[PDB]
A paper describes a structure:
Rpd3S utilizes the conserved Sin3 basic surface to bind to the nucleosomal DNA positions at SHL + 2, SHL + 5, and SHL + 7, under the conditions involving different H3K36me3–CHD interactions and DNA linker interactions.
3D classification of the Rpd3S–NCP187bp complex results in two Rpd3S binding states. One is identical to the SHL + 2 state and another novel state that we termed the linker tightening state. In the linker tightening state, Rpd3S rotates around the nucleosomal DNA axis by ~150° with the Sin3 conserved basic surface binding to the nucleosomal DNA at the SHL + 7 position. The position of Rpd3S in the linker tightening state, which is created without H3K36MLA, further reinforces the notion that the interaction between Eaf3 CHDs and H3K36MLA is the key factor in maintaining Rpd3S on the nucleosomal disc and hence the ability of Rpd3S to sample and target histone tails within proximity. Notably, by measuring the angle between the linker and the dyad axis in the planes parallel (α) and perpendicular (β) to the nucleosomal disc plane, we observed that the exit DNA linker bends with an α angle of 37° in the linker tightening state compared to 27° in H3K9 deacetylation state. Collectively, our results indicate that following deacetylation and absence of constraints from H3K36me3, Rpd3S disengages from the nucleosomal disc while maintaining its interactions with the DNA linkers, which are in turn tightened. The Rpd3S-mediated tightening of the DNA linker could potentially serve as a mechanism that counteracts the binding of transcription factors to nucleosomes at cryptic start sites for repressing cryptic transcription.
Residue numbers in the entry:
A (entry chain T): 24 to 100
B (entry chain P): 22 to 100
C (entry chain S), D (entry chain O): 38 to 133
E (entry chain U), F (entry chain Q): 11 to 117
G (entry chain V): 29 to 120
H (entry chain R): 29 to 119
Write the structure that this text describes.
Amino acid sequence: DNIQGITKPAIRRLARRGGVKRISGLIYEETRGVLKVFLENVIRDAVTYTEHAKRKTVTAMDVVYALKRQGRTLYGF
Amino acid sequence: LRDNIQGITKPAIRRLARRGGVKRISGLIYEETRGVLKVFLENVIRDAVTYTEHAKRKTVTAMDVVYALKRQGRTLYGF
Amino acid sequence: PHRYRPGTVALREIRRYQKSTELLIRKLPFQRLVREIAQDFKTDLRFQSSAVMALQEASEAYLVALFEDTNLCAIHAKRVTIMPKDIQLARRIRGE
Amino acid sequence: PHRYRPGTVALREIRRYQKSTELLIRKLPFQRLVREIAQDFKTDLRFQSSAVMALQEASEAYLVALFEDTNLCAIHAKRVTIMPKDIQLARRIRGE
Amino acid sequence: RAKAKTRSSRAGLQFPVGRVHRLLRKGNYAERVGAGAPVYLAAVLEYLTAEILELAGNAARDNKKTRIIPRHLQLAVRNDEELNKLLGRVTIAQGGVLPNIQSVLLP
Amino acid sequence: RAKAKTRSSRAGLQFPVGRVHRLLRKGNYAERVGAGAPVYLAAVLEYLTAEILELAGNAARDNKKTRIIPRHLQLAVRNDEELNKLLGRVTIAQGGVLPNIQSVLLP
Amino acid sequence: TRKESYAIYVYKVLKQVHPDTGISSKAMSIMNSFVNDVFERIAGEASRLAHYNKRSTITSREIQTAVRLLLPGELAKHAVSEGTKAVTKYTS
Amino acid sequence: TRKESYAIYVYKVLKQVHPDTGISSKAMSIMNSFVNDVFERIAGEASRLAHYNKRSTITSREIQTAVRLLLPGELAKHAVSEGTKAVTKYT
C-alpha cells in the first residue's frame, strides 16, 4: 500500500521541478511504476552491499556507493 | 588532407539508417549525422592519442582504441 | 471570483520549485515505500534516517531528470502534455 | 518502367542491412576522416589497420544505435521521416 | 608423492582457476586473495561462457550454420533479457542488430 | 637540525600531498607510487576545488548571500559547460536544477 | 611475458555444450574479450567491496556480492549457485 | 575507525579564492564527496594506464594522462598547467 503512499501533488511538484507545464492523468501510474523499478534496483544493490558487510541495517554510505556503481553518484553523504 | 567529412557519403548514412530500421531519411539529416559522427570520432580519437602519448607510443594500436571506447562506457569486443 | 488562465499558475509553480531545493516528496510515504521494497529482499531490515534521506534525494533527482526528458520528448512531438509513451521513449533511449 | 513503391525498397534495405553484418561505410573514407581528425592532436600520427577497423566498428555501432533512437523518436512524434531535431533530442537525453 | 591434480578437475569446471588467481594477484586488486575467490570467479566465468555459447549455438541452429559467427554471438547476447541488461553498454564487432521493424512501418 | 619544510609547503600548494600519497599507497592501485604523482594529483584537486568554489561563490553573490550552500554548488556545476560535462552522471543533493523555462512553455 | 587467452577453455565449454558446432576466430576474440571484461568488472567490484569494508583480502563472499551486483536477474542467482557448487567441490 | 575529512583544506582553498565567503556543513560534505570522487576516478584511470603497458608504478605522467582523459577541454589544459607549475615549484 506504500506504493500509492506517494501523492499525486508530489508527482506534480516533481514535474514542476523538471520544467513541465501540464501532466496527463494516466502518467502518474507509469511514473510510480518506473520509480518502483528504480528504487527496487537501488535497494537491491544496497541490500547486497549491506549483506556483504554482515550488517542488518542499510547505512547511507553503501547506498551512495550503490548509486555510484550505477552511474548515478550521490554527493553530500 | 582536409575536408574529409564528405568521405562519409550520403548512401553510407542511408545504409546506417537502414540498419537502424529507418524507413524515411530526410535530406537535412546527413549533415547532422556527419557532425555527430565527427564529434564522437574526436572524443574517441583524443582519448586514443592521449593513451598513445602516455606510453611513448607513436602509432595508434587497436588495443588503446578499444580501451578508450570502454572508458567512455562503449566497450568493443573482438579486438 | 478571480480566475487564472491555465498555465500561469503552472509556470509560477515551475519557477518556485526551481529556485528552491525543498523536499518535494514527503518523508513518511517514501520511507514506507523503501521499507516495503526492502522487506522482500531481507526481513527485519533497518534504515537509518540519513540513508532514507540520501535515497530520497537520489530518487527525486532521477525523477526530475526523467521528467525533464519527458517534457523534452513532448515538445519534440509538438505536445504540451506528457504521456507515458514519452517516459517509455526516454527510458528506452537512456537504456533503463 | 516498373517502379516499386517509395517505402517498400526502404523496408527491404532495412531487412537486408539488419540481417547482414557487412560494414556500411567504406574503409578508405573513414580512415582518411580519422587521420584528418587526429592530425589536429598529434603531428605525424600513424594508425594501424586493426585500430581503424575497431574505430569503424564502434562508429557504425554508435551511429546505428543513434539511428534506432531517432527512428523511435520519429514514431513517437507520429512521424516516419527522421529530422536533425530527433538527433539533437536523442543526444541531449543521454547528455552528449 | 601423489600425482598433482589440476584445478579444473578439483573444482569440476573448465576455466583456469590458476590463471584467474594469477591475474587477481598480478592485477593488484587486493594485497591478499582468498583460496575460494579464483574458484568462484572461474565458476561464474564458465557459467556465463556456457550460457552465451549455448544461446549462440541455438541461434546458429535457427540459421543452420554449424559454426559460431559474431552475428550469432550478437544475436545470443541481445536476445536474452538478462544478457541484454548485463551487456547493454557493450559493442560487439561484426554483429549488427536484431531485425526488428515497427508495426506502423510495415504495410 | 633544520626545521621541517613538509611536502605541500615546499611546492607552494595548499592541498595535502602527503594525504594523497598515503591514500594512493593504501589504495593498492599500483605496486609503486612516484614522488610527483601525489603532487600532481593534489595540484589538480586544488585547481578543481578552487574553480568550483569560485563559481559557487559567484552564484552566491548573485544570490545576495556570502555563504556557499549546495544549491550554489549545483548551479555552479550546471552553469559552466566543462564542469557540467565532467559531472553529467553526478547528482548533487540539496541542489535542485537550473531555473530554465522552455520557449514554447512561456505565453 | 605470455599473453593471456581463454581459447581452449572457451572451446572446451562449447564442446561440452554443443559438441557438433565449432567457433570462429573472430567469435573467439569476442568471447575472450567478454570473459576478460567480465573478469575485470567482477574483480574490480570485489576489490572495491573489500576496500569499502576495510578488508585487505578478496574471498568467495566478495565474488558472490559482485555477481549479485553486476549480473542482473536470473543470471545472478545462477552464477551464485554455480560458485557455491564450485566452492563445495573444492572443499570436498 | 576514524574517517578522513578535507574541511580545513577546502576551507583554506576558499579563503585563498574568496577571503570573505563562508560555506555550510552540507556544502562541506558535498565538496568532500566531490573531491573524493574525482580522486577515485583519477586514481583508477592512472592505475588502468599503468596496467595498460605492464607498468607497476604511477608517476606524474599517469596522473597527467588521467586528467586529460577525464577533464574536458580548457579545464584539462588548466589542470595540466597547474600540475606542471606545482611540480616545477617542487623541483
